[PDB]
Structure formats: structure tokens, C-alpha cells
Design a protein around this ligand. Structure first.
Ligand SMILES: [Mg+2]
Ligand SMILES: [Mg+2]
Ligand SMILES: [Mg+2]
Ligand SMILES: [Mg+2]
Ligand SMILES: [Mg+2]
Ligand SMILES: [Mg+2]
Ligand SMILES: [Mg+2]
Ligand SMILES: [Mg+2]
Ligand SMILES: [Mg+2]
Ligand SMILES: [Mg+2]
Ligand SMILES: [Mg+2]
Lengths: 166, 166, 166, 166
């Protein structure tokens, strides 16, 4: 029985365990995308590194929530990480879709904290996660728009390049 | 149609556009006050610079909210900046009155975020704006009190001096 | 009644107050242009920063004229800053059009100084404003011409990336 | 007969020699003011140094005009430097009055250059003299206004101490 735990509903503990699983699954899709654009036939190394670094940071998010689960006196429960599936534009639109899905799950986590009168968890989600999440979505939204604008071929390669020196 | 926008009510988008207008209008009053105490006949250069620097920072606040409007996938709408109108004490009491008006508008913006279940905007307003706003009000309240205490003439000039080397 | 005022006609004082209003209004349009290209869907961050910094420097022009109004012993009068309205080519042509109307207003101010036998104000406008104005117009004219040359899509994005690191 | 002289009217040469005389005379009054506030009984050393350095810079203005007379191929003609005459407020108002008569003489010199189609001399007066003159008048006007505000006694002494470390 936890020594630290206080004002920490089992709903909140459970929502954090679910969000941990979301971050792992998104980290896995980003590793898939890295694995794709790193192909010899694709050779978009800018997108490969951006997706590779995006995968480290989703896993760092999972670590932060494990660390937060234990700070609060909850217990971490791990679930299966499901396998994931112009290509550049499609991948960015996929990445945008995933950040918004992560955002949507984080808002639900926030709602669980609101409804359980857990204000430190609510401020944790809104300070350490919700603020980066909207910055990430806008950044990826701009990537989507820039890939639409450069068009296929030379412009995609140029935008990849670019990512690689950034 | 916005790629980024998510859980961002048109009320919230509209409140940010209104707050942008409040910051511009307050920035304009501070430039008026700077323009006044910079007069040859007034020569209160400490208050002129303090009001001049206060004008840059209100405009920086407007920029932050434009930047935030676009981060959230909203669209910036700009409205007219209306013309503004012991002198030292009166100007500080005017400045205090304006910080409290800005504060009151920011709380309404916060309420719009509360009512629309937009927690990142609420934490943005309370973290990036509401905390400086109460620090600014207290600082200006102390200026008001110090100008009351020094009295007219020599004490006003001394307090201006003071501001100038601060 | 001003202690400093000497050979400073009410026409000149009035012309400076109008040019103050012009610089604020141009500063406001540049902030509008900043707010537009900073959109998630537009994502031309090079133009957003160029318009944002152009906005900063028009406001600094307004401050210099306030500072000059008070140096000359005149009195600053502030008027309302009215709200402003390929997108990249169109915005640069709008910006070229604003620099030229700013220039045209500056020459009228210069004429007012010529007619009121105010050689210091005439040399101020010539030295501190008319020389930058003519350099700014050429720079923006060059940007117009480069955006026509690069064409839509990939070339616009490339030119924008140039601005962003320039 | 001058090797350099070109488009340099005898009116312009004569106007420079008169302005040389004006700067020497203003330099002399400032040395008088220095000599007064340096008295043991007056002991306002901040005003004494400010008037002493003001005297140095009026003499440097005379040297620049000699240097300019010779640059233009004219011939310097020197005339007698006539002897000069709350004390602090009164002396600053006297100093404001001298900067403005110096300004008025400079504009007449500028007019002489305008009428003799001497644009280099006109731009010299505008650029090297009329711009500092207008800044000096404002500065001294501000000192007048601050000495009115601080009042007699302790405030005058305080303002003087400010000058001494400024
Ligand atoms: Mg994440
Ligand atoms: Mg992310
Ligand atoms: Mg503000
Ligand atoms: Mg403030
Ligand atoms: Mg007239
Ligand atoms: Mg300008
Ligand atoms: Mg000139
Ligand atoms: Mg410009
Ligand atoms: Mg003649
Ligand atoms: Mg002089
Ligand atoms: Mg002088």
C-alpha cells in the first residue's frame, strides 16, 4: 500500500496508465515512419531523422508519466504496444493526426483530473503536456502546409533537406 | 480551414481577438503617457521611459496572443485602436486603472476558456498573463503609494529619478 | 506653453502628428501580415518574421517622431489606428504600396517644412526618414520581383526560407 | 586669392564670421556662469561643471566654423568677444535664452546659404549645427522645468548633485 498516495483517485491512476500506453503507441508509429523514409528507395533522410527524434520524445513522454504515476503513489500498468502500418505529405498528415489523437486523449486525462478534484494532476497535464502538444500540432500543421505548397518531387526533396539541417 | 485547430471554440478564438485589441489599446495609452512626460515643459524622463517601456511590453503581449491564436488554429481579427486622451500621481493612477482593466478582461477570457472546456487556453492565460498581471498591478500600486508619500515638487522629481535609474 | 519651441510652425507640429498616425497604421498592417503568414495553413514563417520585424520598425519610426515632436516643443496628438484588411506576391505588393504611401506622406511633411522655413525639420525628414524610406522601397521592390521570378509553389517556399535565414 | 573657393558668396563667408563671433560670445557667458556657481558662497558644483563643459563645446563650435571657413576658401575675421553680465533657475533660463538666440542666428546663416544657392553650407548648418542646437535647447528646457519643479533650497541642491554625476 502506497506511502505517498493522497487525493489520487483510481480513475486518475488509470487515465495515466492509459496515456502511458498512448505515448508508447505513438512512439512506435514514429519509429515505423523513421523505418520507412530511411529506406534506400525513399532516401528522405530529413523526414527519417525528424520521425526518429519524434519517437525518442514520445518515449520520453511515457517515461515522464511513469515517473509521475510513481510520484503520486499510483502503480504503473503496461499494456500491449500495437503494431503500426505523396508519401511525405501523407506521413505528415498521419503525424498530425497522431498528435491530435494524443491531444484528445490528454484532454480526457485532464477531464478525469477535473472530475476527481485532482488539481495538481490537472496542472501537470496542462503545464507539462498540453502546452507542448499544441505547439507540436501547429509545427506539424505547418509542415503539412509547406509540403502541400512545394509540390511533389524537387520541392519535397528540398523540404526534406531543410528538415535534415534543422 | 485550419489544420491545427482542435478543441478551440469560436468563443475562445473571439475572446483572444478581443484581448489582442485590449493590449493594443493599453499599449497606445502608455505611448500617450510617454509622449506627455517627455515634453520639454514636463521633463519627467523617468516616467517617460517607464511608460515607453510599458508600451513595448503591452505590444509584446499582443504579439504573444497573435502567436497563440495561430498556434491554436484560430484566425486573427484586428479592430481599431482608439485614441487615448499632480500629473505624475494622476498618470500612475491611470496606469493602475488600465492594468486592472486588462486584468478584468483577462479573467473574462479565462472564464470563456473554463466554460468551453479549453484547459490549455485557461492555463495559458493563467500562466503567461494572469501571473505577470498581478505582479504589474502591485508594482504600479506601490508607485501610486510612493508618489502619494513623496508629495508634489521635489519628491515627485526624486521619484522620477529613481525610475530613470531602474 | 513650450519652453523649447522656436521656429516651429503649427503646420509642422500638425504634419508630424499626422505622420505619427501614418507610421502606426503601417505598423498595424505589417502586424496583420505577420498574423496571416503565421497561420498554420499558410506557414510561410520567413514572411511572418519579415512582416513582424517590419511592424516593429514602423512603431520605432512613430516613437522617433514623438521624440522629435517633443524635442521641437510641439505637442503630440494621437488619432485612431484604423484596422487593416499568390498570397506571397500579393502581400509584398501591398507592402511596397504601403512604403510608397508612407514616402508620399513624408514628402508632404517635408514640403510643409520647406514652406514654413523649417530647415531643421526638413533635414530631419531627409536624413532620418527619406533616406531609409527609399532604401526600404527598393528592397521591397526587389522582393516583389524575386517572387514573380520564382513562381508559385516551390519557389515561393524557397524565397520564404531565404527570408527566414536573412 | 583662394585656391579652393567655389560657389562661396561673400554673404556666406561673412555670415560664418558672424556666427563664429556668436559662438565665442556664448562660450564666454557659459564661462561666466561657470565662474559664478564655482563661488565658495554658491557652491553648486554640478552647475559649475555643466556650464564649464558647455563653454568648452561652444568654443569647439567656433573652431569647427573656422575650420569650415577655411575649407570653403573664405577668410576668418574675428570681432571682440563682449564681456557678459533662484540663481539656479535664473541661470538655466539665461542658458536656454542663449541657445535659442544661437539657434536664431544659425537659421539666419542658413537663410543666407539658401539665398546664395549654397547647398553645401546649408546642409552643413542643418547637419552639424541645427540638429545639435535643437537637442541642446530641449535638454536645457528640461533642466528649466526640473528646477521649477524641485523648488528652492534642498531641491536645487539635489538637482545640482544629479548634474555633477551626469
Ligand atoms: Mg506525446
Ligand atoms: Mg509531440
Ligand atoms: Mg498586457
Ligand atoms: Mg502590464
Ligand atoms: Mg500654415
Ligand atoms: Mg516608416
Ligand atoms: Mg540636408
Ligand atoms: Mg519601412
Ligand atoms: Mg548678397
Ligand atoms: Mg553652439
Ligand atoms: Mg549648445
Amino acid at each position: 500500500v502506497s506511502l505517498a498516495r493522497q487525493n489520487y483517485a483510481d480513475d486518475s491512476e488509470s487515465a495515466i496508465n492509459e496515456q502511458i500506453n498512448v505515448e508508447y503507441n505513438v512512439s512506435y508509429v514514429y519509429h515505423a515512419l523513421f523505418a520507412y523514409f530511411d529506406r534506400d528507395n525513399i532516401a528522405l533522410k530529413g523526414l527519417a531523422k525528424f520521425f526518429k527524434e519524434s519517437s525518442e520524445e514520445e518515449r520520453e513522454h511515457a517515461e515522464q508519466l511513469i515517473k509521475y504515476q510513481n510520484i503520486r503513489g499510483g502503480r504503473v500498468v503496461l499494456h500491449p504496444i500495437t503494431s503500426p502500418p505523396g508519401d511525405a505529405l501523407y506521413a505528415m498528415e498521419l503525424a498530425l493526426s497522431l498528435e491530435k489523437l494524443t491531444n484528445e486523449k490528454l484532454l480526457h486525462v485532464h477531464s478525469v483530473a477535473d472530475r476527481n478534484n485532482d488539481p495538481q494532476l490537472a496542472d501537470f497535464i496542462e503545464s507539462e503536456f498540453l502546452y507542448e502538444q499544441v505547439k507540436s500540432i501547429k509545427k506539424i500543421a505547418e509542415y503539412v502546409a509547406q509540403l502541400r505548397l512545394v509540390g511533389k518531387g524537387h520541392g519535397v526533396w528540398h523540404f526534406d533537406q531543410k528538415l535534415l539541417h534543422d
